[PDB]
Design an enzyme around this catalytic site. Structure first.
Site, PDB file in Angstrom:
ATOM      1  CE  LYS A 270     -30.651 -27.500 -22.020  1.00 28.40           C
ATOM      2  NZ  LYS A 270     -29.179 -27.690 -22.203  1.00 28.40           N
TER       3      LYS A 270
ATOM      4  CD  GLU B  90     -24.399 -23.200 -23.919  1.00 28.91           C
ATOM      5  OE1 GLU B  90     -25.046 -24.120 -24.284  1.00 28.91           O
ATOM      6  OE2 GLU B  90     -24.597 -22.155 -24.434  1.00 28.91           O
TER       7      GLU B  90
ATOM      8  CB  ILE C 207     -25.177 -34.524 -16.407  1.00 26.88           C
ATOM      9  CG1 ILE C 207     -25.761 -34.145 -14.842  1.00 26.88           C
ATOM     10  CG2 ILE C 207     -25.604 -36.041 -16.531  1.00 26.88           C
ATOM     11  CD1 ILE C 207     -27.162 -33.594 -15.042  1.00 26.88           C
TER      12      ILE C 207
ATOM     13  CG  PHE D 132     -18.861 -31.876 -27.927  1.00 25.84           C
ATOM     14  CD1 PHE D 132     -19.779 -32.914 -27.911  1.00 25.84           C
ATOM     15  CD2 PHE D 132     -18.922 -30.823 -26.667  1.00 25.84           C
ATOM     16  CE1 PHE D 132     -20.977 -32.950 -27.111  1.00 25.84           C
ATOM     17  CE2 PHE D 132     -19.999 -30.973 -25.802  1.00 25.84           C
ATOM     18  CZ  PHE D 132     -20.919 -32.112 -25.994  1.00 25.84           C
TER      19      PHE D 132
END
Ligand SMILES: Cc1cc2c(cc1C)N(C[C@H](O)[C@H](O)[C@H](O)COP(=O)(O)OP(=O)(O)OC[C@H]1O[C@@H](n3cnc4c(N)ncnc43)[C@H](O)[C@@H]1O)c1[nH]c(=O)[nH]c(=O)c1N2
Ligand SMILES: Cc1cc2c(cc1C)N(C[C@H](O)[C@H](O)[C@H](O)COP(=O)(O)OP(=O)(O)OC[C@H]1O[C@@H](n3cnc4c(N)ncnc43)[C@H](O)[C@@H]1O)c1[nH]c(=O)[nH]c(=O)c1N2
Lengths: 503, 503
Positions: free
Chosen positions: B78, B345, B349, B439
């Site tokens: 990805k 987005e 996980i 982030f």
């Protein structure tokens, strides 16, 4: 033989005023009706969702159209019951809902649409039965009204109404046409040797007398059970729920809309109703005292809607069964003094007005021909028995096994021989009763059974022989989809629709 | 104070096995780990695209390199998310696509490249932001791999993997290093008066006990929500999607290639993911039950890929929010039992492995120092809050107004004060956070905002003063073009690249 001239009804709940208005309507002459109601003994402050026969049988009989009584009782529309979490062990991440819709399913070449659908599910069609066979489930999902704005009817519907007001609306209606309202309490009932009712003695001093007595007294069955000593056949071996915890809840109509249906949300040890109307909805966790404490069910009931431990509630106990006989001597029981099942498919108010229809169909004179009483009693049994089959069927077909209550329903029930035979016919793949009112059709058993995931063993051997037939059904499935689609863009929301009958 | 010695994890989904392997890795000594998983309650059969931190934080921590776990989980690359039809009201004759790419954007003389670009768009430059600022969007368009054949890394990338296998790979990995797997179901949970967890009672008879409990139980939050009664803060006022309809689809890899990215195709009442891997791709129309019926979204989902009404599907319901507190008493929730946003987005996980990092960073002893629990809870809130800003930002900047759902996103949302301030700083023309992991950088807000066609009011007053600076950026734009060009003729297709890790 003198006609029946003076009639006393005991009780002014829903059963009580439906009887006064129905009887005041049927008995155009030589009729004198008095209804006595203790203001110390309140109405059971529930009984709020209905089945379509209410208008045809009850209100039409009175000469009151839908547009006249709805506004005055905070009336709303019920297009179906939506069943939530009855199928599998619950899962927040899974959508376990099916509707039970009103209205019939079309037939193609003498075989109901449900059955062409199943043959398709056999080839791996995925769309659930009701979304394929009925034009409206998607509309309900989107909280759409059952009419266009201008008022044209677009589906079959029943009603949700405020119980209190319904009683007040008919109280006004009845008194007005000469019904005589007495606010007193019955404390003693006098019999003769033969075993009939000579008089009621009240608290405030009154001695009441009449040719004919309607016990609308609630589950106490003051006349029928207590005075007249008639046995109640207990049926907890058939259906387990025996209690409820209910309340009204605020709805933000302007943002969550108003669902055009009853919900029945399966719980640990019962299930909960949702009955939306403008502004608010009525809700009740119907439960089984055997499987959960009343205080636990309260906790679950508050937990489920995020209510506060400050919220006033209606704590209810109920008896499940029917009097050995609904009408004994010169007494006839209508409503909770007679037979109840449980609120799961709104058979209650229906037992009231259906019984009153039968009462008038079997109306006596003062000789009290027992052939009339017997005939009547038998119709009550059959109506009640039929209903019991259908409600019971929601329970023993369940796949859930995550609680003791769901285990028992699956395992421990006494099932009539009549419901066993229907199940076995559905299991072989045969349609149940279809049509082109004395009631629960193939389409009803099918929504219920198919919703809980018990499908027949196979599709009809006959279908292998009629490929054209299969095609024609394809087209009928295609119309239905068109109709579902048109409705999506044509119905106003239920909130908006209701909002205009006067706000 | 005794150390924590016995640990029980409830659940064997992705959250469950990531916890077992992470904890079995971090806790090198005095650690005893049991994971219980009901084979009656399946995994949520999704969760398939990832962000770059997965290797650095999760797999590197375990000592498993990319070349070892990819082949074994049908792993693919990805490089970005490609956003399709989010900008305007859709048009088949128009190309409405932007990427959101991984990796940082260079700075020229202390100002990010995005900002030199905008000054150019102001003079009528036409090339969209990402094609000008990042070397790789054109490669992705041509379905190129993110490496040369010989394996050298050419862009930042994350991964698509098969969810089921990922769970099985870590199950094998964990059990092997001494993790104790129990296949049973938890039915009762026992508390003490203080309000901690003394024991779990299972279906098959087992009483489970431990110093420490990880709720990896899914959205049911068996330990954290149900037993421990911790509130879930609902956040449907922030983001509207609450449902999904998913499935795997055949891909003719040999002729259409395998896209090195996630797509997010905007729909009427949600959007649809595409997650290609070798042979197949995972897809899901994430939608809002408020704006479309589940059956309508199914229809749209099949219509969009030309699937058949015979195709098996995964019908999903989801809760949007975070527990008031992720870790209460001696229970810690990891995964769907804790906080979710929506798959837009791939923050899911990430919430798992980031939480496990924080768990180990805040690891307790048996006294359960609440200063550790508080610190942990606060990091979860901040991580979750940050993510929510960013996802939410895809929605309220939209120009689309062609459906009720797009209208609501544009209008009806509750927006944190933190996302409002970021938007207002971007609107004045200021860079957001840049870099030279706790982030989401200027480059991320920029791809998103610029993609949806909300650009700043002007370029930086400062630029008028630094013409040389402007020139230097011209050169940097010139390198990028060279790199884009080299890549076009140097990368193998993604199909061909993947094909060789073992076919
Ligand atoms: C939990 C629950 C939920 C539902 C329902 C029942 C229950 C238990 N029902 C049934 C429905 O509530 C019921 O059929 C009627 O609304 C009320 O019937 P009654 O008038 O028998 O009883 P109720 O008990 O309401 O009224 C009794 C009347 O008798 C009077 N009375 C009693 N003793 C007296 C005495 N000694 N002297 C004088 N007066 C006396 C009282 O004063 C009062 O006027 C229902 N049905 C349906 O079709 N759909 C539904 O959704 C529901 N929901
Ligand atoms: C529609 C959609 C799409 C996505 C995602 C979510 C959703 C809803 N996610 C999130 C991702 O799917 C999720 O974080 C993990 O894959 C699964 O997390 P869990 O293990 O919490 O839940 P899950 O619900 O999968 O597993 C639950 C486990 O708990 C067990 N269990 C439950 N109750 C039990 C009991 N009483 N007793 C015993 N065992 C019990 C079950 O047996 C099972 O082992 C995602 N994230 C991301 O980063 N990128 C993505 O693209 C996506 N995509």
């Amino acid at each position: 033989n003198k006609p029946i001239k003076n009639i006393v009804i005991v009780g002014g709940g829903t059963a009580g005023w439906m009887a006064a208005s129905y009887l005041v309507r049927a008995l155009q002459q030589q009729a004198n009706i008095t209804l006595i109601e203790s203001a110390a003994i309140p109405r059971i402050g529930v009984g709020e969702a209905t089945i379509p026969s209410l208008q045809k049988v009850f209100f039409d009989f009175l000469g009151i159209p839908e547009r006249e009584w709805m506004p005055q009782v905070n009336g709303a529309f019920k297009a179906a019951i939506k069943f939530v979490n009855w199928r599998k062990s619950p899962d927040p991440s899974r959508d376990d809902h099916f509707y039970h819709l009103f209205g019939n399913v079309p037939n193609c070449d003498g075989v109901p649409l449900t059955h062409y659908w199943l043959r398709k599910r056999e080839q791996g069609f995925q769309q659930p039965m009701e979304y394929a066979c009925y034009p409206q489930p998607g509309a309900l999902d989107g909280k759409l009204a059952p009419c266009l704005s201008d008022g044209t009817r677009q589906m079959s519907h029943a009603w949700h109404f405020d119980a209190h007001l319904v009683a007040d609306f008919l109280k006004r209606w009845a008194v007005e046409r000469g019904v005589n309202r007495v606010v007193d309490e019955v404390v003693d009932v006098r019999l003769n040797n033969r075993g009939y009712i000579s008089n009621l003695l009240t608290k405030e001093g009154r001695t009441l007398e009449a040719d004919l007595f309607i016990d609308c007294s609630g589950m106490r069955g003051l006349l029928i059970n207590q005075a007249l000593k008639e046995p109640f056949i207990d049926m907890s071996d058939y259906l387990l729920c025996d209690s409820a915890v209910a309340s009204a809840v605020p709805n933000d109509d302007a943002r969550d809309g108003v669902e055009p249906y009853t919900s029945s949300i399966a719980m640990n040890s019962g299930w909960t109703w949702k009955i939306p109307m403008l502004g608010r909805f009525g809700s009740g966790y119907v439960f089984s005292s055997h499987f959960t404490s009343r205080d636990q069910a309260t906790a679950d009931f508050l937990k489920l809607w995020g209510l506060s431990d400050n919220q006033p509630l209606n704590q209810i106990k109920f008896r499940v069964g029917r009097n050995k006989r609904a009408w004994v001597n010169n007494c006839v029981s209508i409503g909770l003094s007679s037979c109840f099942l449980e609120p799961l498919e709104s058979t209650g108010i229906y037992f009231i007005y259906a019984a009153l229809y039968q009462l008038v169909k079997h109306f006596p004179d003062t000789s009290f021909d027992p052939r009339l009483s017997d005939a009547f009693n038998a119709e009550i049994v059959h109506m009640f028995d039929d209903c019991r089959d259908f409600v019971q069927a929601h329970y023993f077909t369940t796949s859930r096994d995550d609680t003791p209550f769901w285990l028992a329903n699956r395992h421990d029930l006494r099932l009539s021989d009549a419901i066993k035979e229907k199940v076995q016919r559905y299991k072989a793949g045969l349609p149940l009763t279809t049509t082109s009112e004395f009631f629960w059709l193939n389409g009803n058993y099918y929504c219920i059974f198919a919703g809980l995931g018990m499908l027949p063993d196979r599709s009809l051997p006959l279908l292998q022989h009629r490929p054209e037939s299969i095609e024609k059904a394809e087209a009928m499935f295609a119309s239905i989809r068109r109709e579902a689609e048109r409705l999506r863009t044509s119905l106003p929301t239920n909130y908006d629709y209701l909002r205009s009958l006067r706000d």
